[PDB]
Amino acid sequence: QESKGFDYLIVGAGFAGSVLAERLASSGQRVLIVDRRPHIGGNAYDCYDDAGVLIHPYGPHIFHTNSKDVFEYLSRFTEWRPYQHRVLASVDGQLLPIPINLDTVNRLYGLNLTSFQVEEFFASVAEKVEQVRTSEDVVVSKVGRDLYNKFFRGYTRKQWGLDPSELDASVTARVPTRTNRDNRYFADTYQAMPLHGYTRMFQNMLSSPNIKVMLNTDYREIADFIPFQHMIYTGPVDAFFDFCYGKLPYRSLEFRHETHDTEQLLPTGTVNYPNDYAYTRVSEFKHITGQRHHQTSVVYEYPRAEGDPYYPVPRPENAELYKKYEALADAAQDVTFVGRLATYRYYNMDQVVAQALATFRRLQG
Amino acid sequence: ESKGFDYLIVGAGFAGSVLAERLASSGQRVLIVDRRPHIGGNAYDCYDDAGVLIHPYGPHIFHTNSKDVFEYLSRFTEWRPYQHRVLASVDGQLLPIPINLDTVNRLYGLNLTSFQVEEFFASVAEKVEQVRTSEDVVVSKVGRDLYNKFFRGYTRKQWGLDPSELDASVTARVPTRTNRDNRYFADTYQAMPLHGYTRMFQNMLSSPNIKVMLNTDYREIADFIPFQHMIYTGPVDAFFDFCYGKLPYRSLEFRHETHDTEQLLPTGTVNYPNDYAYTRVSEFKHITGQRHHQTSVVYEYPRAEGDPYYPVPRPENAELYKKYEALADAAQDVTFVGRLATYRYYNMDQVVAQALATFRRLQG
Ligand SMILES: Cc1cc2nc3c(=O)[nH]c(=O)nc-3n(C[C@H](O)[C@H](O)[C@H](O)COP(=O)(O)OP(=O)(O)OC[C@H]3O[C@@H](n4cnc5c(N)ncnc54)[C@H](O)[C@@H]3O)c2cc1C
Ligand SMILES: Cc1cc2nc3c(=O)[nH]c(=O)nc-3n(C[C@H](O)[C@H](O)[C@H](O)COP(=O)(O)OP(=O)(O)OC[C@H]3O[C@@H](n4cnc5c(N)ncnc54)[C@H](O)[C@@H]3O)c2cc1C
Ligand SMILES: O=c1ccn([C@@H]2O[C@H](COP(=O)(O)OP(=O)(O)O)[C@@H](O)[C@H]2O)c(=O)[nH]1
Ligand SMILES: OC[C@@H](O)[C@H](O)[C@@H](O)CO
């Protein structure tokens, strides 16, 4: 009776949205992809700054996956610059590797333990657990309270506004503790940055004539009058349902960007600050991108309880609230929910990509 | 909450973007649309594979004599002062163009003063009764030899027509000088948007009343997007499905290159009237002021096929355009604005003025 219009209206041009727009469009669907922001990319958006330095406006995005499927998929849209991110935490005035490893321990205390001895060292400080439900429990019961306190407690209190004990184990479990001497932030098979940035990658992803891209646009601003047959939604679950069950908490961030007139400011990709400063970490994009430049650009991150949602807050009382919403989302007939914000999952880029690719299969089936 | 738009603007170049900003500031609801995946239309600039700030559709040098236009654009961008300089490759030399005192002195091995090069120009000019073509314009000012060395081959190369087959308004665009002024433009306001056109454009479209749709031909969505008025900045002939035949526009192919050196050319653009397939090379860093270890240049090759860039001004074409101009003047809720829409050889600043004036009309 009324126009059929687009087969899909996708809300959010992040990895979640863009992947599905590419997949759907290649199968011949007509797609409108909208984002409240004036650009594509979601968080992973990158751009050149006032000084001509390629940066990440929303904090550093380092690509990493163990999934051949995901890596070969994204390779359809970008070439790679091999890169393995390394993070140093500022503790006791030293820059020490994080995740904690054999060197972290020897350097901090002045030991000369072997990998074999550090296993035993942990075993002798480890608290015994027992439950193993919280973020405190994962660390403490592997490396004991002193290391927990110097590396995790403060940082976590600062990033989440919550003590490690008030967070699900899944949070701090994301950072392993090692007895070897690996100083890499990630141990995944494929670690590489999109050669020319993420944005270039998104552009190729969204290039299909079957995809129309609409920026500076809340879907609600067009959904009353633009015809569409199905919606893939990728923003926060709560807002889509009017906060009917109340605000699902999402941690946010302020970013302070700065340019310095020197080639290198930091000894590595990111320096973390668990025990000092308003900020949690500083990053220097050139280590990440490989860009040569007479100057250098860095971003300082400030955890904010308010503002654009960036992280779900995994804990039992948020997981309970999310179920209220998951139930509504599932029941919603012509709407598919996918991505970090829309499914309330602490997902990495590769993971969202894999989730979106799984969804596309579901839709096709 | 909203139920549609007041304006559907086809084209996110200067023409449409200016109108979008003015309309929206006056509280109108605006959906701007481009076939391309990016705004800025023709002036769109971006960073290449090497991190050099370039112009994918040919160097765009901003210059205006209009205090009004310049102050308008100033709300959206800061400026890097820059007065573009072109050098023409003639007889194995790099000579200033516009032809000036120094072009003439260095070419012929002369030592004329400014007062003398006027008599020299008068002494070789060919008097034409009435000045009709691009040949007449050049020849009645500097003579048949300079015309040949600097205009004929270049023109034949650029347009695929002799300057004799082109309206006078084409070569008249390039002043002939008795002074030693070596700028391509003598305009009052000469500067580039500090951080590039695209960043300027982004500000321009930033209002909440502006919805931006890319990768989209208007025809794909006009049947189901509610809008009052349409502003169209595409090609006129195409809008009327080519009913009277193709309106001829001239096109361009761009070959971009990056070199491992800080500077490849002695100025921003070198023109080749008499040599090579390309009409010109430009070095972007000259224009943007960017600092960089390497450098990116672009060679422009004239093409008869491709995206429309130039209208071909001449009697048979102005006549074909009147036919289309008629249909557009009839078009009820369509305003035609822009270099393509109105088939005019307009500069960036000139299109900005066209748009501001259209906004004033559209408002009273
Ligand atoms: C600071 C930071 C650093 C990170 N670093 C890494 C890293 O190093 N490695 C890694 O793998 N992952 C990293 N991530 C996570 C990564 O960004 C996510 O996995 C990714 O964002 C998932 O993409 P998405 O599509 O699910 O969500 P998003 O990128 O958040 O996209 C959702 C989009 O939908 C839009 N939207 C929401 N509501 C509406 C609506 N009302 N109307 C229109 N548009 C709407 C939003 O503007 C947003 O752009 C990082 C995240 C942050 C915040
Ligand atoms: C190579 C070159 C160099 C130039 N150098 C200078 C210079 O140095 N100084 C100067 O002042 N001027 C210069 N100009 C002129 C300048 O580019 C134009 O004056 C200016 O772009 C006019 O803006 P516009 O909006 O009218 O046209 P455009 O910028 O061409 O915008 C038209 C847009 O509408 C879109 N469109 C058309 N049809 C449709 C449709 N069917 N559906 C959706 N979208 C559509 C097109 O994709 C295009 O992006 C140059 C032009 C060229 C080609
Ligand atoms: O130096 C650190 C880094 C990690 N974390 C904890 O580990 C969690 C996961 O951090 P990760 O870097 O894996 O996720 P990200 O914050 O980068 O998105 C953090 O939120 C912190 O609670 C920490 O305590 N100290
Ligand atoms: O005003 C003098 C110069 O022309 C400048 O524009 C500099 O080159 C800036 O980079």
Coordinates of N, CA, C and O in Angstrom, one line a residue, chain B residues 91-217:
Chain B
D91 N 59.5 27.7 -25.2 CA 60.9 27.7 -25.7 C 61.9 27.3 -24.7 O 63.0 27.9 -24.5
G92 N 61.7 26.2 -23.9 CA 62.6 25.7 -23.0 C 62.7 26.5 -21.7 O 63.7 26.3 -20.9
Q93 N 61.8 27.5 -21.5 CA 61.9 28.3 -20.3 C 60.6 28.3 -19.5 O 59.6 27.8 -20.0
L94 N 60.7 28.7 -18.2 CA 59.5 28.8 -17.4 C 59.1 30.3 -17.3 O 59.7 31.1 -16.5
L95 N 58.1 30.7 -18.1 CA 57.8 32.1 -18.1 C 56.5 32.4 -17.4 O 55.6 31.5 -17.2
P96 N 56.4 33.6 -16.8 CA 55.2 34.0 -16.1 C 54.0 34.2 -17.0 O 54.0 34.6 -18.2
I97 N 52.8 33.7 -16.5 CA 51.5 33.8 -17.2 C 50.5 34.1 -16.1 O 50.4 33.4 -15.1
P98 N 49.6 35.1 -16.4 CA 49.5 36.1 -17.4 C 50.9 36.5 -18.1 O 51.8 36.8 -17.4
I99 N 50.9 36.7 -19.4 CA 52.0 37.4 -20.0 C 52.2 38.8 -19.4 O 51.2 39.6 -19.4
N100 N 53.4 39.0 -18.9 CA 53.7 40.4 -18.4 C 55.0 40.9 -19.0 O 55.5 40.4 -20.0
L101 N 55.5 42.0 -18.5 CA 56.7 42.7 -18.9 C 57.9 41.7 -19.0 O 58.7 41.6 -19.9
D102 N 57.9 40.8 -17.9 CA 59.0 39.9 -17.8 C 58.9 38.7 -18.7 O 59.9 38.1 -19.2
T103 N 57.7 38.3 -19.0 CA 57.5 37.3 -20.0 C 58.1 37.7 -21.3 O 58.8 37.0 -22.0
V104 N 57.7 38.9 -21.7 CA 58.1 39.5 -23.0 C 59.7 39.7 -23.0 O 60.3 39.3 -24.0
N105 N 60.2 40.3 -22.0 CA 61.6 40.5 -21.9 C 62.4 39.2 -21.9 O 63.4 39.1 -22.6
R106 N 62.0 38.2 -21.2 CA 62.8 37.0 -21.1 C 62.6 36.1 -22.3 O 63.5 35.3 -22.6
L107 N 61.6 36.3 -23.0 CA 61.3 35.4 -24.2 C 62.2 35.8 -25.4 O 62.8 35.0 -26.0
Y108 N 62.1 37.1 -25.6 CA 62.8 37.7 -26.8 C 64.1 38.3 -26.6 O 64.8 38.7 -27.5
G109 N 64.5 38.2 -25.3 CA 65.8 38.8 -24.9 C 65.9 40.3 -24.9 O 66.9 40.9 -25.3
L110 N 64.8 40.9 -24.5 CA 64.5 42.3 -24.6 C 64.8 43.0 -23.3 O 64.8 42.4 -22.2
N111 N 64.9 44.3 -23.3 CA 64.9 45.1 -22.1 C 63.9 46.2 -22.1 O 64.2 47.4 -21.8
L112 N 62.6 45.9 -22.3 CA 61.6 46.9 -22.3 C 61.2 47.4 -20.9 O 61.3 46.6 -20.0
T113 N 60.8 48.7 -20.8 CA 60.2 49.1 -19.6 C 58.8 48.8 -19.7 O 58.3 48.3 -20.7
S114 N 58.0 49.2 -18.7 CA 56.6 49.0 -18.7 C 55.9 49.9 -19.8 O 54.9 49.5 -20.4
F115 N 56.5 51.1 -19.9 CA 56.0 52.0 -20.9 C 56.2 51.6 -22.3 O 55.4 51.8 -23.3
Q116 N 57.4 50.9 -22.5 CA 57.8 50.4 -23.8 C 57.0 49.1 -24.2 O 56.5 49.0 -25.3
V117 N 56.7 48.2 -23.3 CA 56.0 47.0 -23.6 C 54.6 47.2 -24.0 O 54.0 46.4 -24.7
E118 N 54.1 48.4 -23.7 CA 52.8 48.8 -24.2 C 52.8 49.2 -25.7 O 52.0 48.7 -26.5
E119 N 53.8 50.0 -26.0 CA 54.1 50.3 -27.4 C 54.4 49.0 -28.2 O 54.0 48.8 -29.4
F120 N 55.2 48.1 -27.6 CA 55.5 46.8 -28.2 C 54.2 46.0 -28.5 O 54.0 45.5 -29.6
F121 N 53.4 45.9 -27.5 CA 52.1 45.2 -27.6 C 51.2 45.9 -28.7 O 50.6 45.2 -29.5
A122 N 51.2 47.2 -28.8 CA 50.4 47.9 -29.8 C 51.1 47.7 -31.2 O 50.4 47.9 -32.2
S123 N 52.4 47.4 -31.2 CA 53.1 47.4 -32.4 C 53.0 46.0 -33.1 O 53.6 45.8 -34.2
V124 N 52.4 45.1 -32.4 CA 52.3 43.7 -33.0 C 50.8 43.2 -32.9 O 50.5 42.1 -33.4
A125 N 50.0 44.0 -32.3 CA 48.6 43.6 -32.1 C 48.0 43.6 -33.5 O 48.4 44.2 -34.4
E126 N 47.0 42.7 -33.7 CA 46.2 42.7 -34.9 C 44.9 43.3 -34.5 O 44.2 42.8 -33.7
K127 N 44.6 44.4 -35.2 CA 43.3 45.1 -35.0 C 42.1 44.2 -35.5 O 42.2 43.7 -36.6
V128 N 41.2 43.9 -34.6 CA 40.0 43.2 -35.1 C 38.8 44.1 -34.9 O 38.7 44.8 -33.9
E129 N 38.0 44.2 -35.9 CA 36.8 45.1 -35.9 C 35.9 44.9 -34.7 O 35.8 45.8 -33.8
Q130 N 35.4 43.7 -34.5 CA 34.7 43.4 -33.3 C 35.3 42.1 -32.7 O 35.6 41.2 -33.4
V131 N 35.4 42.1 -31.3 CA 36.0 41.0 -30.7 C 35.0 39.9 -30.2 O 34.3 40.0 -29.2
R132 N 35.0 38.8 -31.0 CA 34.0 37.8 -30.8 C 34.6 36.5 -30.2 O 34.0 36.0 -29.2
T133 N 35.7 36.0 -30.7 CA 36.2 34.7 -30.2 C 37.4 34.9 -29.2 O 37.9 36.0 -29.0
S134 N 37.8 33.7 -28.7 CA 39.0 33.7 -27.9 C 40.3 33.9 -28.6 O 41.3 34.3 -28.0
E135 N 40.3 33.8 -30.0 CA 41.4 34.2 -30.8 C 41.5 35.7 -30.8 O 42.5 36.3 -30.6
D136 N 40.3 36.4 -31.2 CA 40.3 37.8 -31.2 C 40.8 38.5 -30.0 O 41.5 39.5 -30.0
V137 N 40.4 37.9 -28.8 CA 40.7 38.5 -27.5 C 42.2 38.6 -27.3 O 42.7 39.7 -26.8
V138 N 42.9 37.5 -27.5 CA 44.3 37.4 -27.4 C 45.1 38.2 -28.4 O 46.2 38.8 -28.1
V139 N 44.7 38.1 -29.7 CA 45.4 38.6 -30.8 C 45.4 40.2 -30.9 O 46.3 40.8 -31.4
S140 N 44.3 40.7 -30.4 CA 44.1 42.2 -30.5 C 44.8 42.9 -29.4 O 44.8 44.1 -29.3
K141 N 45.4 42.1 -28.5 CA 46.1 42.6 -27.4 C 47.7 42.3 -27.4 O 48.5 43.2 -27.1
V142 N 48.0 41.1 -27.8 CA 49.5 40.8 -27.8 C 50.0 40.3 -29.1 O 51.2 40.0 -29.3
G143 N 49.2 40.1 -30.1 CA 49.7 39.7 -31.5 C 49.7 38.2 -31.7 O 49.4 37.4 -30.8
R144 N 50.0 37.9 -33.0 CA 49.8 36.5 -33.4 C 50.9 35.6 -32.9 O 50.7 34.4 -32.7
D145 N 52.1 36.1 -32.6 CA 53.2 35.3 -32.1 C 53.1 34.9 -30.7 O 53.2 33.7 -30.3
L146 N 52.8 35.8 -29.8 CA 52.5 35.5 -28.4 C 51.3 34.6 -28.3 O 51.3 33.5 -27.6
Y147 N 50.2 34.9 -29.0 CA 49.0 34.1 -29.1 C 49.4 32.6 -29.4 O 48.9 31.7 -28.7
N148 N 50.2 32.4 -30.4 CA 50.7 31.1 -30.8 C 51.5 30.4 -29.7 O 51.2 29.2 -29.3
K149 N 52.5 31.1 -29.1 CA 53.3 30.5 -28.1 C 52.6 30.2 -26.8 O 53.0 29.2 -26.1
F150 N 51.6 30.9 -26.5 CA 51.0 30.9 -25.1 C 49.5 30.4 -25.0 O 49.1 30.0 -24.0
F151 N 48.8 30.6 -26.1 CA 47.3 30.4 -26.1 C 46.8 29.3 -27.0 O 46.0 28.5 -26.6
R152 N 47.2 29.4 -28.3 CA 46.7 28.5 -29.3 C 46.8 27.0 -29.0 O 45.8 26.3 -28.9
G153 N 48.0 26.5 -28.8 CA 48.2 25.1 -28.5 C 47.6 24.7 -27.2 O 47.0 23.6 -27.1
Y154 N 47.8 25.5 -26.2 CA 47.2 25.2 -24.9 C 45.7 25.1 -25.0 O 45.1 24.1 -24.6
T155 N 45.1 26.2 -25.5 CA 43.6 26.1 -25.8 C 43.2 24.9 -26.7 O 42.2 24.2 -26.3
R156 N 43.8 24.7 -27.8 CA 43.5 23.5 -28.6 C 43.5 22.3 -27.8 O 42.7 21.4 -27.9
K157 N 44.6 22.2 -26.9 CA 44.8 21.0 -26.1 C 43.7 20.9 -25.0 O 43.0 19.9 -24.8
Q158 N 43.5 22.0 -24.2 CA 42.4 22.0 -23.2 C 41.0 21.7 -23.7 O 40.4 20.9 -23.1
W159 N 40.6 22.4 -24.7 CA 39.2 22.4 -25.2 C 38.8 21.4 -26.3 O 37.7 21.0 -26.5
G160 N 39.8 21.1 -27.2 CA 39.6 20.3 -28.4 C 39.0 21.2 -29.4 O 38.5 20.7 -30.4
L161 N 39.1 22.5 -29.3 CA 38.7 23.5 -30.2 C 39.7 24.6 -30.4 O 40.6 24.8 -29.5
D162 N 39.8 25.2 -31.6 CA 40.6 26.4 -31.8 C 40.1 27.5 -30.9 O 38.9 27.5 -30.7
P163 N 40.9 28.4 -30.5 CA 40.4 29.6 -29.8 C 39.4 30.4 -30.7 O 38.7 31.2 -30.2
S164 N 39.5 30.2 -32.0 CA 38.6 30.8 -32.9 C 37.2 30.3 -32.8 O 36.2 30.9 -33.2
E165 N 37.0 29.1 -32.3 CA 35.7 28.4 -32.3 C 35.2 28.5 -30.9 O 34.1 27.9 -30.5
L166 N 35.8 29.3 -30.0 CA 35.4 29.5 -28.7 C 35.0 30.9 -28.4 O 35.6 31.9 -29.0
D167 N 34.0 31.1 -27.6 CA 33.5 32.5 -27.3 C 34.6 33.3 -26.7 O 35.5 32.7 -26.1
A168 N 34.6 34.6 -26.8 CA 35.7 35.4 -26.3 C 35.9 35.3 -24.8 O 37.0 35.5 -24.3
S169 N 34.8 35.0 -24.0 CA 34.9 35.0 -22.6 C 35.8 34.0 -22.0 O 36.1 33.9 -20.8
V170 N 36.4 33.1 -22.9 CA 37.2 32.0 -22.4 C 38.7 32.5 -22.2 O 39.2 32.5 -21.1
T171 N 39.4 32.9 -23.3 CA 40.8 33.4 -23.1 C 40.8 34.8 -22.5 O 41.8 35.2 -22.0
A172 N 39.7 35.5 -22.5 CA 39.6 36.8 -21.8 C 39.8 36.7 -20.3 O 40.2 37.6 -19.7
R173 N 39.6 35.5 -19.8 CA 39.8 35.2 -18.4 C 41.2 35.4 -18.0 O 41.5 35.6 -16.8
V174 N 42.2 35.4 -18.9 CA 43.6 35.6 -18.5 C 44.1 37.0 -19.0 O 44.5 37.1 -20.2
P175 N 44.3 37.9 -18.0 CA 44.7 39.3 -18.3 C 46.1 39.3 -19.0 O 46.9 38.4 -18.9
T176 N 46.2 40.4 -19.8 CA 47.5 40.7 -20.4 C 48.1 41.9 -19.7 O 47.4 42.9 -19.5
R177 N 49.3 41.9 -19.3 CA 49.8 42.9 -18.5 C 51.1 43.6 -19.0 O 51.9 43.0 -19.6
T178 N 51.2 44.9 -18.7 CA 52.4 45.6 -19.0 C 53.3 45.8 -17.8 O 54.4 46.3 -17.8
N179 N 52.7 45.4 -16.6 CA 53.5 45.5 -15.4 C 54.2 44.2 -15.2 O 54.2 43.3 -16.1
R180 N 55.0 44.1 -14.1 CA 55.8 42.9 -13.8 C 55.1 42.0 -12.8 O 55.7 41.2 -12.1
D181 N 53.8 42.2 -12.7 CA 53.0 41.4 -11.8 C 52.9 39.9 -12.2 O 52.4 39.7 -13.3
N182 N 53.4 39.0 -11.4 CA 53.5 37.6 -11.8 C 52.5 36.7 -11.1 O 52.7 35.4 -11.2
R183 N 51.5 37.2 -10.5 CA 50.4 36.4 -9.9 C 49.4 36.0 -10.9 O 49.1 36.7 -11.8
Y184 N 48.9 34.8 -10.8 CA 47.8 34.3 -11.7 C 46.6 35.2 -11.5 O 45.9 35.5 -12.5
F185 N 46.3 35.6 -10.3 CA 45.2 36.4 -9.9 C 45.7 37.7 -9.3 O 46.7 37.8 -8.6
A186 N 45.0 38.8 -9.6 CA 45.3 40.1 -9.0 C 44.2 40.5 -8.0 O 44.1 41.6 -7.6
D187 N 43.4 39.5 -7.6 CA 42.3 39.7 -6.7 C 42.7 40.2 -5.3 O 43.9 40.0 -4.9
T188 N 41.8 40.9 -4.7 CA 42.0 41.5 -3.4 C 42.1 40.5 -2.3 O 42.8 40.7 -1.3
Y189 N 41.4 39.4 -2.4 CA 41.5 38.4 -1.3 C 42.0 37.1 -1.8 O 41.3 36.4 -2.6
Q190 N 43.2 36.7 -1.4 CA 43.8 35.4 -1.9 C 44.4 34.6 -0.7 O 45.4 35.0 -0.1
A191 N 43.8 33.5 -0.5 CA 44.1 32.6 0.6 C 43.4 31.3 0.5 O 42.4 31.2 -0.2
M192 N 43.9 30.3 1.2 CA 43.4 28.9 1.1 C 42.9 28.6 2.5 O 43.4 29.1 3.5
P193 N 41.8 27.8 2.6 CA 41.3 27.4 3.9 C 42.4 26.6 4.6 O 42.8 25.6 4.1
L194 N 42.8 27.2 5.7 CA 44.0 26.7 6.5 C 44.1 25.2 6.5 O 45.2 24.7 6.2
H195 N 43.0 24.5 6.8 CA 43.0 23.1 7.0 C 42.3 22.3 5.9 O 41.9 21.2 6.0
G196 N 42.1 23.0 4.7 CA 41.5 22.3 3.6 C 40.0 22.6 3.4 O 39.3 22.9 4.4
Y197 N 39.6 22.6 2.2 CA 38.2 22.8 1.8 C 37.2 22.0 2.5 O 36.2 22.4 3.0
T198 N 37.5 20.7 2.6 CA 36.6 19.7 3.2 C 36.3 20.0 4.7 O 35.2 19.7 5.2
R199 N 37.3 20.6 5.4 CA 37.1 20.9 6.8 C 36.2 22.1 6.9 O 35.4 22.2 7.8
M200 N 36.4 23.0 5.9 CA 35.6 24.2 5.8 C 34.1 23.7 5.6 O 33.2 24.1 6.3
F201 N 34.0 22.9 4.5 CA 32.6 22.4 4.2 C 32.0 21.7 5.4 O 30.8 21.8 5.6
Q202 N 32.8 20.9 6.2 CA 32.2 20.2 7.3 C 31.5 21.2 8.3 O 30.4 20.9 8.8
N203 N 32.1 22.3 8.5 CA 31.5 23.3 9.4 C 30.3 23.9 8.8 O 29.3 24.1 9.5
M204 N 30.3 24.1 7.5 CA 29.2 24.7 6.7 C 28.0 23.8 6.9 O 26.9 24.4 7.0
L205 N 28.1 22.5 6.9 CA 27.0 21.6 6.9 C 26.6 21.1 8.3 O 25.8 20.1 8.5
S206 N 27.2 21.7 9.4 CA 27.2 21.1 10.7 C 25.8 21.4 11.5 O 25.5 20.7 12.4
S207 N 25.1 22.4 11.0 CA 23.8 22.7 11.7 C 22.9 21.4 11.8 O 23.0 20.5 11.0
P208 N 22.1 21.3 12.9 CA 21.2 20.2 13.1 C 20.0 20.2 12.1 O 19.3 19.2 12.0
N209 N 19.8 21.3 11.4 CA 18.8 21.3 10.4 C 19.3 20.8 9.1 O 18.6 20.8 8.1
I210 N 20.5 20.3 9.0 CA 21.1 19.8 7.8 C 21.4 18.3 7.9 O 22.2 17.9 8.7
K211 N 20.7 17.6 7.1 CA 20.9 16.1 6.9 C 21.7 15.9 5.7 O 21.3 16.5 4.6
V212 N 22.7 15.1 5.7 CA 23.7 15.0 4.6 C 23.6 13.6 4.1 O 23.7 12.6 4.9
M213 N 23.3 13.4 2.8 CA 23.2 12.1 2.2 C 24.2 11.9 1.1 O 24.1 12.7 0.1
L214 N 25.0 10.9 1.2 CA 26.1 10.7 0.2 C 25.9 9.4 -0.5 O 25.1 8.6 0.0
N215 N 26.6 9.2 -1.6 CA 26.5 8.0 -2.5 C 25.1 7.9 -3.0 O 24.5 6.8 -3.2
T216 N 24.4 9.0 -3.3 CA 23.0 9.0 -3.5 C 22.6 9.9 -4.7 O 22.8 11.1 -4.6
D217 N 22.1 9.4 -5.8 CA 21.5 10.2 -6.8 C 20.1 10.6 -6.4 O 19.3 9.8 -6.0

